Design a protein around this ligand. Structure first.
Ligand code: HEM
Length: 293
């Protein structure tokens, strides 16, 4: 038997209200710019949107972005979530300013905000997630391991109802940010421009001379002379012939990657949620640049 989670618009709010939150997040991202050696909070926000959505299980409709359960200690302390506390504390002051927004809508909106402010595509976003009680927090272990191969990646993502194209598009977000030894047992960025959203991950995967090395934490990762790295799960995208075809596609067509990421990422943030027919349409927020702010 599966739960239903129906979206309920937080009371009386409309587009102008959520655009105000987006703007608060965007402004903080622009100001609090020294985090992680001047990477900024963009990438950890996108990670947090993904980890809070990616506990979903299509089989019983548990986990996912709806309940905003990352705020509970079981989930907050998942070892897979190490590092994400920085994204939570970045958002805490925003939530105090806008205490009406649910936690789900805030964690997911922070990811949308960060992608758009890092010059990525527009991601339509829908409001309506409702905080659910502590007893609905998912058990640890539902997020993926990095030391596995393409068959594991494919199987993992089937749980999230993601197909080959969706998975490859979604992994393009590893253009952003970096791995941190004390968080995950891997270290280094995937590329040079790690707070601008581009198709650089696919380019570097195909074009770099990758060497399998062991890092100071005794885990294997692929390293290049440029100073980039790839997780084994990243690198398996060029080992699997189906994945590789899509990697080459996104490497050679920026616009296609952007459109495919937008669709897949929205779906990720909306998995598990039922929207009434009279729910508002998806919002497309303007960036600070488009507003002239
Ligand atoms: C195979 C599945 C994935 C694995 C194994 C994986 C693994 C990791 C790991 C280990 C990190 C580094 C954390 C750290 O120690 O600082 C990382 C970072 C990141 N992941 Fe993935 N990830 C996966 C999928 C995704 C997806 C689907 C997204 C897109 C929403 C995503 C977005 C990010 C981002 C933005 C970071 C950078 C965070 C930061 O820079 O602080 N990852 N990932």
């Amino acid at each position: 038997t599966p739960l239903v989670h129906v979206a309920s618009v937080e009371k009386g709010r409309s587009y102008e209200d959520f655009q105000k939150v987006y703007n608060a997040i965007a402004l903080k991202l622009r100001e609090d710019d020294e985090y992680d050696n001047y990477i900024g909070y963009g990438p950890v926000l996108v990670r947090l949107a993904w980890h809070t959505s990616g506990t979903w299980d299509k089989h019983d409709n548990t986990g996912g972005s709806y309940g905003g359960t990352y705020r509970f200690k079981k989930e907050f302390n998942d070892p897979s979530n190490a590092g994400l506390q920085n994204g939570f504390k970045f958002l805490e002051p925003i939530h105090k300013e806008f205490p009406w927004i649910s936690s789900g809508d805030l964690f997911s909106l922070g990811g949308v905000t960060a992608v758009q402010e890092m010059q990525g595509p527009k991601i339509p976003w829908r409001c309506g997630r409702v905080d659910t009680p502590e007893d609905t927090t998912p058990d640890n272990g539902r997020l993926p391991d990095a030391d596995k191969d393409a068959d594991y990646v494919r199987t993992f993502f089937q749980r999230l109802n993601m197909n080959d194209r969706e998975v490859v598009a979604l992994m393009g977000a590893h253009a952003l940010g970096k791995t941190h030894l004390k968080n995950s047992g891997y270290e280094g960025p995937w590329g040079a421009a790690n707070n601008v959203f581009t198709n650089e991950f696919y380019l570097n995967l195909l074009n770099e001379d990758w060497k399998l090395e062991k890092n100071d934490a005794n885990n294997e990762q692929w390293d290049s002379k440029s100073g980039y790295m790839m997780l084994p799960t990243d690198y398996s995208l060029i080992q699997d012939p189906k994945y590789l075809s899509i990697v080459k596609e996104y490497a050679n067509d920026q616009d296609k990657f952007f459109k495919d990421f937008s669709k897949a990422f929205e779906k990720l943030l909306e998995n598990g949620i039922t929207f009434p027919k009279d729910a508002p349409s998806p919002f497309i927020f303007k960036t600070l640049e488009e507003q002239g702010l």
